[PDB]
């Protein structure tokens, strides 16, 4: 009744354990200038992250914050999401330098800006973003990737 809230959580740590494994296998943008922004606002999510899950371990249905370390991890996987997007656009980008739909995408739907980043999101808000307007564009650029891989193998 108690124990099956508990589990509930050790998974979602799992959960975010895999994903961080996976986000692994996605290169890292580097330290170009445009990514600058992104990669201490994911550093800080990271650290945090690992705090709360930490946590997550050691902590006891009982805890008074049990909750806010809760919607806290919730947050930890789209923020994942996001360090994940932008290292594959980042990589596209290399790849397919200059082409204005992968520049547009990237810079209207899913570049992290002081303003504009998930930085001062959470909750509801944070994922409808990235559930919507971040993996849209994410959809459409590799859409466009597609058409390139295939005119590029003429
Ligand atoms: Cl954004
Ligand atoms: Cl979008």
Redesign the pocket.
């Given at each position: 009744e108690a124990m099956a809230k508990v589990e509930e959580v050790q998974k979602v740590v799992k959960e975010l354990e895999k994903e961080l494994g996976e986000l692994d296998k996605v290169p890292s943008y580097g330290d170009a200038q445009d990514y600058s922004y992104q990669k201490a606002l994911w550093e800080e999510f990271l650290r945090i992250g690992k705090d709360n899950m930490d946590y997550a371990s050691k902590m006891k249905a009982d805890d008074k914050f049990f909750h806010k370390v809760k919607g806290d991890l919730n947050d930890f996987k789209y923020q994942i999401k996001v360090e994940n997007y932008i290292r594959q656009v980042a990589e596209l980008r290399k790849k397919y330098p200059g082409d204005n739909t992968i520049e547009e995408e990237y810079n209207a739907?899913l570049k992290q800006d002081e303003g504009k980043s998930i930085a001062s999101q959470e909750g509801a808000t944070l994922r409808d973003y990235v559930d919507?307007?971040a993996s849209?564009?994410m959809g459409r650029i590799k859409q466009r990737v597609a058409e390139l891989e295939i005119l590029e193998h003429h």
């Open positions: 739907h919507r307007e849209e564009a």
